[model samples]
Target: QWSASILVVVPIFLLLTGFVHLLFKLSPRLK
Candidate 1:
């Protein structure tokens, strides 16, 4: 289950971080 968890989680985690930065840039709110 460990390897399966990594395979499933790593990409989702990466995407989350990536989107957060993207949102901050696109957001009008202060940094």
Candidate 2:
């Protein structure tokens, strides 16, 4: 079912999104 696909996809999406969010949050200081 779609739930199985969502379970796998959502965490990867959230992880990628959170990582980008974190990079942006840190980029100013790192620059």
Candidate 3:
């Protein structure tokens, strides 16, 4: 069953996805 792994993986995956999105948008200021 995926019950155990999905919970642990999706949270961080979404977090990293959202954060990478922000970084992409903030690319100029990050310089």
TM-score of each: 0.56, 0.54, 0.60
The TM-score that candidate 1 achieves is 0.56
Clash pairs (backbone) in predicted model 3: none
Better of 2 and 3 by TM-score: 3
From the highest TM-score down, the ranking of the candidates is 3, 1, 2
Off by over 4 Å in 3: 28-31
C-alpha local distance difference test of each model = 0.90, 0.87, 0.87
Quote the lDDT for 17 in model 2: 100
Residue pairs with backbone atoms closer than 3 Å in model 2 (clashes): none
Give lDDT tens digits, candidate 3, residues 1-31.
5687889899989999999888989796675
Which has the greatest lDDT?
1
Count of clashing residue pairs in every prediction: 0, 0, 0
**Model 1 off-target regions past 4 Å?**
28-31
lDDT of 3: 0.87
Worst 10 residues of 1 by lDDT: 1-10
